[PDB]
């Protein structure tokens with residue numbers, strides 16, 4: 001005779017209404033399961049980032065996902081998907097990947113994460129699902145005692161570190177024209193343009209060779225020395241840098257990241273550069289269905305201290321442009337970050353219509369130079385940008 005439940009008081013009961021029924025459920029993806037990797041691939045292929053005119057869409061491949069989402073220390077529960085209960089169809093996704101960065105001006109090192117691949121099926125937008133995905137990944141990261149994050153995005157977000165502008169260097173101008181990526185300037189002809197962008201078919205620098213596992217430690221020292229010039233920079237353990245520069249070195253030969261080094265007579269490494277391949281799907285075109293694209297990644301030179309710096313940097317990027325032809329690259333991209341403004345003009349990079357904002361979650365710092373004029377958004381030559389990190 002009496003109550004069946006244990007005593008409680010108003011403090012013991014939740015203060016927020018219970019959640020109502022949902023047609024969706026959380027689903028932790030396991031990308032080592034090919035079928036699940038296929039689902040993720042499909043979701044982004046049909047629903048990911050497009051340019052302002054809906055002409056092109058980013059196309060991340062299977063190999064690219066395995067490289068980007070599986071760096072040493074990666075966590076499966078940080079690959080968050082959302083599924084329709086009735087059919088089990090994947091309709092949303094977001095990911096966190098470990099990263100360590102340093103703010104050189106205050107000499108502060110932060111073990112953080114990078115948030116990327118936020119995507120919701122086109123037919124499920126404007127239902128405010130995004131805020132939930134963001135809060136859930138935040139929950140899962142905070143659970144591992146990490147409270148800061150680094151990510152990029154469009155203008156739609158408050159207080160960015162800075163804003164950088166995309167730059168484009170045509171390799172196969174004709175194809176770019178054919179798909180509407182570039183237009184013909186007035187009083188100019190298709191042949192005059194092709195002739196102005198033409199490059200040799202073999203690299204010019206002596207000592208240039210593909211980077212190998214033996215070069216990691218030396219290339220890292222070179223990058224660290226070079227990186228001091230920027231405000232925010234990425235740090236790596238030797239295995240992390242190996243992963244990012246060479247990929248999961250199975251039989252080697254990563255098809256997504258390409259690394260090169262320049263060693264002199266004495267066998268000393270004086271320069272290096274890297275870039276990753278991330279094509280564009282051409283939405284509506286009856287002659288081409290894909291645009292080959294390379295993005296400048298991390299690079300360094302020991303001549304930053306000498307007066308031939310700008311010249312050497314231009315030669316270095318020129319050889320990078322030349323090597324990309326071997327991989328079907330139609331246009332080579334980069335941002336106005338790092339010391340890129342030092343070579344943009346002479347290597348014939350043109351400004352694009354896209355911008356990229358950088359954000360730090362839960363961490364305030366002084367704003368940085370984005371390589372462009374704060375007012376006119378135009379590129380400012382030979383300007384060291386505060387941004388020294390590149391995201392995928």
Ligand SMILES: CCCCCCCCCCCCCC(=O)SCCNC(=O)CCNC(=O)[C@H](O)C(C)(C)COP(=O)(O)OP(=O)(O)OC[C@@H]1O[C@@H](n2cnc3c(N)ncnc32)[C@H](O)[C@@H]1OP(=O)(O)O
Pocket residue numbers: 047048049050113115116117118119120121124125126127128129130131134137138141142146147148149151152153154156157361
């Ligand atoms: C310590 C760890 C912390 C970790 C977390 C750190 C923060 C990470 C933050 C994310 C880093 C992402 C890095 C990348 O991957 S940037 C790439 C983003 N992905 C795409 O652009 C793919 C194509 N678009 C889509 O798939 C959807 O439009 C998305 C999923 C973007 C929005 O879906 P939808 O169109 O259906 O909108 P909604 O009704 O559900 O939600 C409403 C909106 O949600 C907020 N919203 C919209 N777009 C973005 C955006 N680009 N960043 C941040 N917030 C964004 C915004 O506040 C607005 O609410 P409010 O303005 O009215 O208040």
Ligand SMILES: Cc1nccn1CCCCc1ccc(CC(=O)N[C@@H](CO)C(=O)N[C@@H](CCCCN)C(=O)NCCC2CCCCC2)cc1
Pocket residue numbers: 049050051052053054055116117152153154166167168169170180181182183349350351352353354355356391392
């Ligand atoms: C990339 C990434 N990873 C993680 C996050 N993000 C950022 C995603 C959110 C921000 C965003 C949205 C969309 C894009 C794609 C985009 O708009 N790219 C532009 C960057 O400029 C572009 O390719 N533009 C082309 C095509 C434009 C077609 C019509 N819209 C262009 O400007 N071409 C001009 C080429 C020409 C310039 C002058 C010299 C000769 C070549 C990038 C980043």
